[PDB]
Amino acid sequence: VGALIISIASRFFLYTGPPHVEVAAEVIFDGIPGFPITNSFVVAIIIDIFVIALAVAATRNLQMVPRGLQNVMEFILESLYNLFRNINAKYVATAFPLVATIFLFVLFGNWFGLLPGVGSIGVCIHDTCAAQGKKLVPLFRAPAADLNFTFAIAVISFVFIEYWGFRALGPGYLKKFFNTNGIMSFVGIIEFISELVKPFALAFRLFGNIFAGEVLLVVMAFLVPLLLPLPFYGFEVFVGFIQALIFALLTYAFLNIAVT
Amino acid sequence: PITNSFVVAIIIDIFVIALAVAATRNLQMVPRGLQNVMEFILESLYNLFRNINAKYVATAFPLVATIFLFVLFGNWFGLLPGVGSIGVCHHDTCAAQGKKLVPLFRAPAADLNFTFAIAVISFVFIEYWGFRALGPGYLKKFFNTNGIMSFVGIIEFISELVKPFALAFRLFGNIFAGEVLLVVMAFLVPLLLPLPFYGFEVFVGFIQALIFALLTYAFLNIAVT
Amino acid sequence: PTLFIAQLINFLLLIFILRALLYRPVMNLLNERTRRIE
Amino acid sequence: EALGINPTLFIAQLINFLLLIFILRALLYRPVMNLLNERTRRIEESVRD
Amino acid sequence: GINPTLFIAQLINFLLLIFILRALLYRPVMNLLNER
Amino acid sequence: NPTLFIAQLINFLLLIFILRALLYRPVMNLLNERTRRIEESVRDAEKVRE
Amino acid sequence: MEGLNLVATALAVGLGAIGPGVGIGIIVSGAVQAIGRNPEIENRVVTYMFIGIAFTEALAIFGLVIAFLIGF
Amino acid sequence: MEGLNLVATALAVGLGAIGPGVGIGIIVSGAVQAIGRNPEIENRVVTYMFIGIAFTEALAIFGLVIAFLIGF
Amino acid sequence: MEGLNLVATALAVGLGAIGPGVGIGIIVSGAVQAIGRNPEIENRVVTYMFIGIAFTEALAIFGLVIAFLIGF
Amino acid sequence: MEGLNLVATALAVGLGAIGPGVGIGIIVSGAVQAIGRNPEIENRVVTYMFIGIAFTEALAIFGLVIAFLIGF
Amino acid sequence: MEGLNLVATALAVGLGAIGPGVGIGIIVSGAVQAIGRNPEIENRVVTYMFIGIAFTEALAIFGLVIAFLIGF
Amino acid sequence: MEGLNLVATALAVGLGAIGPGVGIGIIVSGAVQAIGRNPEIENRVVTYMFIGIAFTEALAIFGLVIAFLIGF
Amino acid sequence: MEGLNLVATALAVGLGAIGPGVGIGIIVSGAVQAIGRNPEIENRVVTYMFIGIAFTEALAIFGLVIAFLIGF
Amino acid sequence: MEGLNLVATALAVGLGAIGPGVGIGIIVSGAVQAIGRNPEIENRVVTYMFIGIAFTEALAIFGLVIAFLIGF
Amino acid sequence: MEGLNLVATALAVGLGAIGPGVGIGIIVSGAVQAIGRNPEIENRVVTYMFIGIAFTEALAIFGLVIAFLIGF
Amino acid sequence: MEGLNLVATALAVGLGAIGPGVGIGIIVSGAVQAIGRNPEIENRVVTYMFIGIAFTEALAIFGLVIAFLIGF
Could you please report the per-residue DSSP string of chain J?
--SHHHHHHHHHHHHHHHHHHHHHHHHHHHHHHHHHH-GGGHHHHHHHHHHHHHHHHHHHHHHHHHHHHH--
What domains are there in chain H, each with its CATH number?
A: 4-71 (1.20.20.10)
- CA dist., res. M53 & res. M21, Å (int): 10
Residue D27 sits at φ, ψ, to 5 deg, of -120, -40
Does J71 reach chain B within 8 Å, measured CB to CB?
Answer: no
CA angle L35/N22/G59 to nearest 5° reads 105
- CA dist., res. H52 & res. I56, Å (int): 12
CB-based contact O52:M28 (threshold 8 Å): yes
Give Cα separations from B23 to B11, B17, B19, B42 (angstroms). Answer: 18, 10, 6, 12
CA angle B32/B35/B39 to nearest 5° reads 105
CB-based contact G66:G11 (threshold 8 Å): no
Phi-psi region of B40 (alpha: psi -120 to 50; beta: other; left: phi over 0): alpha
DSSP letter (8 states) at residue B103 = B
- CA dist., res. J7 & res. A211, Å (int): 38
Nearest chain A CA: its distance from H4 CA (Å): 27
CB-based contact N24:P25 (threshold 8 Å): yes
DSSP letter (8 states) at residue A134 = S
- CA dist., res. M63 & res. M16, Å (int): 5
Query: Given CA atoms B155, B157, B158, B162 in this order, what sign does their dihedral have?
Result: positive
CB-based contact E21:B65 (threshold 8 Å): yes
Resolution number, Å: 3.3
- CA dist., res. L16 & res. J11, Å (int): 12
CB-based contact J56:J24 (threshold 8 Å): yes
B135-165 burial, b at 16+ Cβ within 10 Å, e below that, comes to eeebeeeeeeeeeeeebbbebbebbbebbbb
Does A237 reach chain F within 8 Å, measured CB to CB?
Answer: yes
- CA dist., res. A100 & res. A81, Å (int): 9
Answer yes or no: do H13 and G48 touch at CB < 8 A.
no
Residue A122 sits at φ, ψ, to 5 deg, of -160, -165
Phi-psi region of A33 (alpha: psi -120 to 50; beta: other; left: phi over 0): beta
- CA dist., res. A196 & res. B105, Å (int): 62
* Residues composing chain N: 72
- Beta-bridge mates of residue A123: A137
Nearest chain P CA: its distance from O53 CA (Å): 9
Q: Is residue A5 part of a domain?
A: no
Nearest residue in chain B measured CA to CA from E7: B113
Q: Is residue F1 part of a domain?
A: no
Give chain A positions within 8 Å (CB) of H50. 183-184, 187
CB-based contact A232:M59 (threshold 8 Å): no
User: Which helix (DSSP H) or strand (DSSP E) does residue P39 occupy?
Assistant: none
- CA dist., res. H32 & res. L18, Å (int): 29
- CA dist., res. K2 & res. K15, Å (int): 22
User: What is the longest distance spanned by two Cα atoms in chain C?
Assistant: 52
Q: Domain count of chain D? A: 1
- CA dist., res. K68 & res. G23, Å (int): 26
Nearest chain H CA: its distance from A184 CA (Å): 8
CB-based contact M67:M12 (threshold 8 Å): yes
SS3 A63: coil
Which of D24, D33, D36 is nearest residue A101 as measured by Cβ atoms? Answer: D24
- CA dist., res. G54 & res. A192, Å (int): 10
CB-based contact G31:G52 (threshold 8 Å): no
CB-based contact G63:K12 (threshold 8 Å): no
Nearest chain L CA: its distance from B206 CA (Å): 14
Q: Is residue A251 part of a domain?
A: yes
- CA dist., res. N1 & res. B111, Å (int): 32
User: Which helix (DSSP H) or strand (DSSP E) does residue I40 occupy?
Assistant: none
DSSP letter (8 states) at residue B56 = S
Method used to determine the 3D structure? cryo-EM
Which residues have C-beta within 8 Å of that of residue L40, sequence separation ≥ 6?
none
- CA dist., res. D8 & res. I23, Å (int): 49
DSSP letter (8 states) at residue K41 = G
- CA dist., res. L2 & res. A120, Å (int): 54
- CA dist., res. B157 & res. A86, Å (int): 62
- Beta-bridge mates of residue B87: B103
Nearest chain G CA: its distance from K71 CA (Å): 9
- Beta-bridge mates of residue B103: B87
L19-38 burial, b at 16+ Cβ within 10 Å, e below that, comes to bbbbbbbbbbbbbbbbbbee
SS3 B73: helix
Task: Give the closest residue to B45 by CA, choosing from B223, B222, B224, B206.
Answer: B206
Task: Give the closest residue to N31 by CA, choosing from P31, B99, K56, P42.
Answer: P31
Give Cα separations from M39 to K54, O30, O33, P9 (angstroms). Answer: 29, 15, 15, 47
CB-based contact P70:P8 (threshold 8 Å): yes
Does L56 reach chain J within 8 Å, measured CB to CB?
Answer: no
Which residues have C-beta within 8 Å of that of residue P1, sequence separation ≥ 6?
N1, N4, O1, O2, O3
- Beta-bridge mates of residue B140: none
Question: What is the Cα gyration radius of chain P?
Answer: 17
- CA dist., res. B221 & res. L48, Å (int): 12
Other CB atoms within 10 A of residue B128 CB: 11
- CA dist., res. A219 & res. A23, Å (int): 9
Does K72 reach chain A within 8 Å, measured CB to CB?
Answer: yes
**H-helix segments, chain D:** 7-24, 30-48
CB-based contact I33:H34 (threshold 8 Å): yes
Measured between alpha carbons, how far apart are the two ends of chain J, in Å?
Answer: 16
Q: Is residue A19 part of a domain?
A: no
Which residues have C-beta within 8 Å of that of residue A174, sequence separation ≥ 6?
A188
- CA dist., res. B163 & res. B172, Å (int): 14
Task: Give the closest residue to K59 by CA, choosing from G31, H17, A161.
Answer: H17
Q: Is G65 exposed, middle or buried (0-12, 13-18, 19+ CB in 10 A)?
A: middle
- CA dist., res. N38 & res. N30, Å (int): 12
CB-based contact A150:A144 (threshold 8 Å): yes
CA angle H53/H55/H61 to nearest 5° reads 100
- CA dist., res. F10 & res. F24, Å (int): 20
- CA dist., res. K6 & res. J69, Å (int): 37
Query: What amino acid occupies position K21?
Result: G
Q: Is N55 exposed, middle or buried (0-12, 13-18, 19+ CB in 10 A)?
A: buried
Give Cα separations from A214 to A21, A205, H19 (angstroms). Answer: 11, 14, 33
Question: What is the Cα gyration radius of chain F?
Answer: 21
CB-based contact I36:H41 (threshold 8 Å): yes
SS3 A122: strand
Domain of E3?
1-36
Query: Given CA atoms A101, A102, A105, A107 in this order, what sign does their dihedral have?
Result: negative
Domain of B181?
4-224
Query: Given CA atoms O21, O26, O32, O35 in this order, what sign does their dihedral have?
Result: negative
- Beta-bridge mates of residue A108: none
CB-based contact O46:P48 (threshold 8 Å): yes
Residue I47 sits at φ, ψ, to 5 deg, of -60, -45
- CA dist., res. O16 & res. M22, Å (int): 11
Query: Given CA atoms A186, A187, A189, A193 in this order, what sign does their dihedral have?
Result: positive
N 5-44 residues inside an 8 A Cβ radius of P: 5, 7-16, 18-27, 29-31, 33-35, 37-38, 41, 44
CB-based contact B105:B82 (threshold 8 Å): yes
- CA dist., res. B219 & res. B63, Å (int): 14
Measured between alpha carbons, how far apart are the two ends of chain E, in Å?
Answer: 51
Question: DSSP characters for L4-66?
Answer: HHHHHHHHHHHHTTTTHHHHHHHHHHHHHHHHHH-GGGHHHHHHHHHHHHHHHHHHHHHHHHH
With both helix axes pointing from N to C terminus, report the angle between O19-37 and P42-70 in degrees, rounded to the nearest 10.
170
Which of O21, O27, O66 is nearest residue M29 as measured by Cβ atoms? Answer: O27
Does P63 reach chain N within 8 Å, measured CB to CB?
Answer: no
Q: Is A144 exposed, middle or buried (0-12, 13-18, 19+ CB in 10 A)?
A: buried
Task: Give the closest residue to I14 by CA, choosing from G14, J48, L68.
Answer: G14
CB-based contact C31:B215 (threshold 8 Å): no
Which residues have C-beta within 8 Å of that of residue A168, sequence separation ≥ 6?
A259
Task: Give the closest residue to F48 by CA, choosing from H8, A62, D48.
Answer: D48
Q: Is residue A55 part of a domain?
A: yes
SS3 B87: strand
Optimal mutation site among B11, B16, B27, B115, interface E, most CBs of chain E within 10 A:
B27
- CA dist., res. A229 & res. B221, Å (int): 61
Q: Is residue A29 part of a domain?
A: no
In this complex, whether D and P touch, counting 3 or more CB pairs under 8 angstroms, is: no
Q: Is N38 exposed, middle or buried (0-12, 13-18, 19+ CB in 10 A)?
A: middle
SS3 I18: coil
CB-based contact H22:G23 (threshold 8 Å): yes
- CA dist., res. A131 & res. A112, Å (int): 28
Answer yes or no: do N58 and B222 touch at CB < 8 A.
no
- CA dist., res. K69 & res. K34, Å (int): 39
User: Which helix (DSSP H) or strand (DSSP E) does residue A131 occupy?
Assistant: none
- CA dist., res. N47 & res. N42, Å (int): 8
Residue B70 sits at φ, ψ, to 5 deg, of -85, -50
- CA dist., res. A236 & res. A233, Å (int): 5
Q: Domain count of chain A? A: 1
CB-based contact K15:M16 (threshold 8 Å): no
Residue A17 sits at φ, ψ, to 5 deg, of -80, -65
Give chain A positions within 8 Å (CB) of F18. 230, 234
Give Cα separations from H5 to A212, D37, F10, H62, I12 (angstroms). Answer: 29, 62, 50, 17, 14
